Design a protein around this ligand. Structure first.
Ligand SMILES: [Mg+2]
Ligand SMILES: [Mg+2]
Ligand SMILES: [Mg+2]
Ligand SMILES: [Mg+2]
Ligand SMILES: [Mg+2]
Ligand SMILES: [Mg+2]
Ligand SMILES: [Mg+2]
Ligand SMILES: [Mg+2]
Ligand SMILES: [Mg+2]
Ligand SMILES: [Mg+2]
Ligand SMILES: [Mg+2]
Ligand SMILES: [Mg+2]
Ligand SMILES: [Mg+2]
Ligand SMILES: [Mg+2]
Ligand SMILES: [Mg+2]
Ligand SMILES: [Mg+2]
Ligand SMILES: [Mg+2]
Ligand SMILES: [Mg+2]
Ligand SMILES: [Mg+2]
Ligand SMILES: [Mg+2]
Ligand SMILES: [Mg+2]
Ligand SMILES: [Mg+2]
Ligand SMILES: [Mg+2]
Ligand SMILES: [Mg+2]
Ligand SMILES: [Mg+2]
Ligand SMILES: [Mg+2]
Ligand SMILES: [Mg+2]
Ligand SMILES: [Mg+2]
Ligand SMILES: [Mg+2]
Ligand SMILES: [Mg+2]
Ligand SMILES: [Mg+2]
Ligand SMILES: [Mg+2]
Ligand SMILES: [Mg+2]
Ligand SMILES: [Mg+2]
Ligand SMILES: [Mg+2]
Ligand SMILES: [Mg+2]
Ligand SMILES: [Mg+2]
Ligand SMILES: [Mg+2]
Ligand SMILES: [Mg+2]
Ligand SMILES: [Mg+2]
Ligand SMILES: [Mg+2]
Ligand SMILES: [Mg+2]
Ligand SMILES: [Mg+2]
Ligand SMILES: [Mg+2]
Ligand SMILES: [Mg+2]
Ligand SMILES: [Mg+2]
Ligand SMILES: [Mg+2]
Ligand SMILES: [Mg+2]
Ligand SMILES: [Mg+2]
Ligand SMILES: [Mg+2]
Ligand SMILES: [Mg+2]
Ligand SMILES: [Mg+2]
Ligand SMILES: [Mg+2]
Ligand SMILES: [Mg+2]
Ligand SMILES: [Mg+2]
Ligand SMILES: [Mg+2]
Ligand SMILES: [Mg+2]
Ligand SMILES: [Mg+2]
Ligand SMILES: [Mg+2]
Ligand SMILES: [Mg+2]
Ligand SMILES: [Mg+2]
Ligand SMILES: [Mg+2]
Ligand SMILES: [Mg+2]
Ligand SMILES: [Mg+2]
Ligand SMILES: [Mg+2]
Ligand SMILES: [Mg+2]
Ligand SMILES: [Mg+2]
Ligand SMILES: [Mg+2]
Ligand SMILES: [Mg+2]
Ligand SMILES: [Mg+2]
Ligand SMILES: [Mg+2]
Ligand SMILES: [Mg+2]
Ligand SMILES: [Mg+2]
Ligand SMILES: [Mg+2]
Ligand SMILES: [Mg+2]
Ligand SMILES: [Mg+2]
Ligand SMILES: [Mg+2]
Ligand SMILES: [Mg+2]
Ligand SMILES: [Mg+2]
Ligand SMILES: [Mg+2]
Ligand SMILES: [Mg+2]
Ligand SMILES: [Mg+2]
Lengths: 236, 275
RNA sequence: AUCUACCCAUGGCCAGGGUGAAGCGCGGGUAAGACCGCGUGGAGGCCCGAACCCACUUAGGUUGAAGACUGAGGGGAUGA
RNA sequence: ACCGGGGUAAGCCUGUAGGGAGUCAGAUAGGUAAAUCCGUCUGGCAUAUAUCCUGAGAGGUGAUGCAUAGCCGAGUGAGG
RNA sequence: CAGGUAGAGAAUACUAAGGCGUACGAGUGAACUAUGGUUAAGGAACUCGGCAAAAUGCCCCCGUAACUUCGGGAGAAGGGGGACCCACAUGGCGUGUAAGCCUUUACGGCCCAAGCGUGAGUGGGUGGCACAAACCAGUGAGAAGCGACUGUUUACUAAAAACACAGGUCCGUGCGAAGUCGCAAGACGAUGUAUACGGACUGACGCCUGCCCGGUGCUGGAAGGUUAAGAGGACCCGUUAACUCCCUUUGGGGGUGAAGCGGAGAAUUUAAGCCCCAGUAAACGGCGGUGGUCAUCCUAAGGUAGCGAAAUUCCUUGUCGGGUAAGUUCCGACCUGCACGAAUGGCGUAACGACUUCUCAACUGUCUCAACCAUAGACUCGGCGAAAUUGC
């Protein structure tokens, strides 16, 4: 999505009017969606069986992989331990890429968020003389991923961003009171200058869409703040 | 009561229908029904003698007892009150303790289950039939005879009643629903009470077809006709004289009751018009 | 009155698709109500449109295929 | 792979889905006479998936038959 | 009677069973005529007039104005998607056999792997100029007039603003009624009974017209010449410049007559006698106070300006604007004492219209300005073979 950032409300109205007038941009305001990711909460194994006998090249492939939960930031990993070359080496990339696409499409329903920090561990599979194919093995790995994900929980993570809150020293109490109701934690209140105070805090991204406007309204223009994604936290 | 249609269609904008509240049964007694075919307004010659009549829904005749003399001292109870296409009022069905079923006009306020008794000794409750000499002066009656034994002829339509003004010698002086005073022999019979469906006159039929279902055909005005067809055009009317209407057969306005009539000796006074 | 106008008795016909009246039930409102939403329901000289019935425009015909038609469009089509 | 077959009534059995229906006794002149029939009034026993009536269709029989996809040979055309 | 595939369909396209090639032909790029098709650039400039053509057309999502009788207007308008392959998907839904469960065991009930059928959606990919690819299949918006609406109408030049209509008003009819058909008997009205029937005019619905019970009428019935307190809810009372004439006595009433302003409270409803009041009005009236808006009460023939009900109508006897380059319909505002009429015959009106008039968008051979293609004729050959007309 394309996101327009404005200082406040009147300037936002002015810029949207200019866009719809100087350039004829007919648009409607919509909710801004924050980035989100998915992670595994437990370890499980999967079984993927594929049979598709179409009019071109007959496709049939079976794969058996293993997935384990990994710490946030680990990224995607793959370990292969097939014994005796049961599945062809040329099709290992096919299965791999099928699993990568399947985990990209998500595992939590049709709205599965990008699964991250997961290791796929292939061990077993069956092969056919003619029915083996790139696409076949791709889906076989995909379905193995579905079966593995179906056995344990999937945890959602939201990106917490470091927020540097600069408010006058007399208004630090207000920020402490309101951020307390904002599920926020305060890592310090460093005096920015003689009047304002830099506040060290990290807050979930969902809470930071409207932070600037309320900060400026409460500070009567004395509110300046910075945001920077730090890490990911599960749903409270 | 009257149920008003919602204006979902130009044919039903201001229309209304009779809320058939008093009706108990939706079918007639099989033995009291007689066949009946429309005529279109044509007499035995085949010519149109009454215009604007024809078509209309098929209907069957219910045998109504206008001659309640056979059963005196035999009480009856009303079985149902039901619909009758042939007349404006509803018809009540009487089960006689004797064991005979009969039909009468349903009077006002008559409910299912009441007891109807006739003769000289009957009470003055609504629905009871009495010879006129036994009816105290001042009550409201309906379905009155003209000659002693000829059957009821007067005050039959819905919401219609007459006031028994008094008695003298052999004759009782009555007031017609039209408002005139008429004398009738006190040996005639009459039923106590008004006639039901007092809200009949408030029905708004709403569309031309609804009146066509009732067997009435459209009327063409006389002015839009040719002089060979209707004597209007000549004489005007309007606000000049009194020849405002002329009948299609050339007759002007005026009194149409035949002068020098026997019954004229019985008429205490004629009705009055014109505020 | 085997054409046509009107009426009378007795039969028949009206593909397909929409909209969604009263009534009934639940919920809200209220002391009770007006009324308001959600379901059932399937009204109506209701809507779109074949058969069927008409005849608004236009072209042709005009010693015609026809002494009133044809081709394209057109109106009504559960109702007087 | 393709082509062609992949049939058979009324009637007679059975009585399903659906629909409908209280039963017994007494009295009674109202039904041109008379009625055990029909009405009307009294009671008694009944709410039963009890019973009866009606009733599409399924199933059996009709049918060891009839018809049929096809296969054979003849020559007017007969025959299987 | 009603096959199959698409389709919502008995539409349309193709086709099965079945039935036809139907009765003058054979040729030939003439003009011209008819019916089809296409057209550069422009797009109503054509014309009395967008006549005729062209255009829109389906399904699914989204989104819908003035006004209103609250039903509509509305499919308003406007915007986006539509093909094929694959995956989700051994999914979902429908049906239901095997297996299983249950019961008053039977033409029983529940669930139901398999089998068959079938959408809708999301994601990715492929192809074309084009995916509702053919056939089929709304043009839309605004303003004025008339008629409320659906209908009916001059078979064969007029479908409308004409007729009808639902609603309204008046008149007649007390009952083998009035009316009608018949010389009559008889019949319809009606197996009806004044909330009914017949005749006349008007024609949905909505909105603005005012003053009041003495005499005389009419009418029903004691409301009443005498009237119990209380129920019954506008005024009088407390409060007056200018005047031209007045009537009374410790200030108010007419004419030219200006505005004003509150609270004690005026009778139908509740009881006694012949006569009566009361109900009704410009239908027997009636035009004057009082207050409003039938309340004490005062005035017989005149629907008659009633009233002076600012939506007023040729009202360019002008001053203007709006629309077009050039303005018709029409739209607005101001003058014209006299015109000029509708208060029950006149202004309004949503919805509806093969109605009349006008504007805009889209679209096009209507036009600038015509060209080309095919059929059916014309034309050539063979066969059959007319007609109107006709002093020569
Ligand atoms: Mg005869
Ligand atoms: Mg009439
Ligand atoms: Mg009736
Ligand atoms: Mg009426
Ligand atoms: Mg109406
Ligand atoms: Mg008329
Ligand atoms: Mg005429
Ligand atoms: Mg005329
Ligand atoms: Mg004639
Ligand atoms: Mg004459
Ligand atoms: Mg005349
Ligand atoms: Mg007049
Ligand atoms: Mg007139
Ligand atoms: Mg005069
Ligand atoms: Mg006169
Ligand atoms: Mg519904
Ligand atoms: Mg409802
Ligand atoms: Mg219709
Ligand atoms: Mg229509
Ligand atoms: Mg016709
Ligand atoms: Mg010619
Ligand atoms: Mg010809
Ligand atoms: Mg034609
Ligand atoms: Mg046609
Ligand atoms: Mg049509
Ligand atoms: Mg139609
Ligand atoms: Mg086969
Ligand atoms: Mg019996
Ligand atoms: Mg059988
Ligand atoms: Mg078909
Ligand atoms: Mg067809
Ligand atoms: Mg064939
Ligand atoms: Mg030829
Ligand atoms: Mg030639
Ligand atoms: Mg040619
Ligand atoms: Mg052409
Ligand atoms: Mg062109
Ligand atoms: Mg072009
Ligand atoms: Mg134009
Ligand atoms: Mg010109
Ligand atoms: Mg022009
Ligand atoms: Mg012109
Ligand atoms: Mg046209
Ligand atoms: Mg066209
Ligand atoms: Mg809409
Ligand atoms: Mg639309
Ligand atoms: Mg519109
Ligand atoms: Mg068991
Ligand atoms: Mg069981
Ligand atoms: Mg089973
Ligand atoms: Mg492309
Ligand atoms: Mg259309
Ligand atoms: Mg059409
Ligand atoms: Mg006007
Ligand atoms: Mg004009
Ligand atoms: Mg009309
Ligand atoms: Mg009108
Ligand atoms: Mg019409
Ligand atoms: Mg004509
Ligand atoms: Mg027309
Ligand atoms: Mg015509
Ligand atoms: Mg006409
Ligand atoms: Mg009328
Ligand atoms: Mg009338
Ligand atoms: Mg007579
Ligand atoms: Mg009258
Ligand atoms: Mg008249
Ligand atoms: Mg009207
Ligand atoms: Mg008229
Ligand atoms: Mg008019
Ligand atoms: Mg007068
Ligand atoms: Mg004028
Ligand atoms: Mg001008
Ligand atoms: Mg004008
Ligand atoms: Mg008048
Ligand atoms: Mg007007
Ligand atoms: Mg209008
Ligand atoms: Mg029209
Ligand atoms: Mg040229
Ligand atoms: Mg030719
Ligand atoms: Mg020749
Ligand atoms: Mg000759």
């Amino acid at each position: 999505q394309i996101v327009l950032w404005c200082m406040g409300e009147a300037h936002a109205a002015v810029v949207l009017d200019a866009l719809s007038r100087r350039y004829g941009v007919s648009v409607d305001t919509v909710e801004l969606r924050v980035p989100l990711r998915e992670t595994f909460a437990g370890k499980a194994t999967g079984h993927g069986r594929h049979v598709k006998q179409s009019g071109g090249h007959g496709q049939y492939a079976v794969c058996d992989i293993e997935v384990e939960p990994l710490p946030e930031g680990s990224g995607f990993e793959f370990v292969d331990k097939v014994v005796g070359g049961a599945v062809p080496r040329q099709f290992i990339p096919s299965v791999e890429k099928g699993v990568r696409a399947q985990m990209e499409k998500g595992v939590t329903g049709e709205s599965g968020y990008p699964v991250v920090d997961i290791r796929v561990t292939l061990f077993d599979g069956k092969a056919h003389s003619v029915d083996s194919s790139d696409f076949a093995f791709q889906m076989a790995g995909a379905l193995a991923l579905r079966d593995a994900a179906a056995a344990t929980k999937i945890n959602l993570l939201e990106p917490v961003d470091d927020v540097t809150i600069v408010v006058p020293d007399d208004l630090v109490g207000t920020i402490m009171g309101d951020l307390s109701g904002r599920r926020g934690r305060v890592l310090g209140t460093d005096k920015h200058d003689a009047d304002r105070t830099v506040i060290k805090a990290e807050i979930p991204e969902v809470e930071l869409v409207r932070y600037a406007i309320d900060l400026r309204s409460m500070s009567h223009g004395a509110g300046q703040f910075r945001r920077s994604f730090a890490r990911y936290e599960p749903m409270p | 009561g009257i149920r008003k249609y919602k204006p979902t269609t130009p044919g039903r904008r201001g229309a209304s229908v009779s809320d058939f509240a008093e009706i108990t049964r939706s079918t007639p007694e099989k033995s009291l029904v007689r066949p009946l075919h429309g005529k279109g307004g044509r007499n035995a010659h085949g010519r149109i003698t009454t215009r604007h009549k024809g078509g209309g829904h098929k209907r069957a005749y219910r045998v109504i007892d206008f001659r309640r003399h056979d059963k005196d001292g035999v009480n009856a109870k009303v079985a149902h009150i039901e619909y009758d296409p042939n007349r404006t009022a509803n018809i009540a069905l009487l089960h006689y303790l004797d064991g005979e079923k009969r039909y009468i006009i349903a009077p006002q306020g008559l409910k299912q289950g009441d007891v109807i008794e006739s003769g000289a000794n009957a009470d003055i409750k609504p629905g009871n039939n009495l010879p006129l000499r036994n009816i105290p002066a001042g009550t409201v009656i309906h379905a009155v005879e003209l000659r002693p034994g000829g059957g009821a002829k007067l005050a039959r339509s819905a919401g219609v009643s007459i006031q028994l003004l008094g008695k003298e010698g052999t004759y009782a002086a009555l007031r017609m629903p039209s408002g005139e005073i008429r004398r009738v022999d006190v040996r005639c019979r009459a039923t106590v009470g008004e006639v039901g469906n007092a809200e009949q006159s408030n029905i708004n039929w709403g569309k031309a077809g609804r009146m066509r279902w009732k067997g009435k055909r459209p009327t063409v005005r006389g002015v839009v006709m040719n002089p060979v067809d209707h004597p209007h055009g000549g004489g005007e009317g309007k606000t000049s004289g009194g020849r405002h209407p002329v009948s299609p057969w050339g007759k002007p306005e005026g009194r149409t009751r035949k002068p020098n009539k026997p019954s004229d000796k019985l008429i205490v006074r004629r009705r009055r018009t014109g505020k």
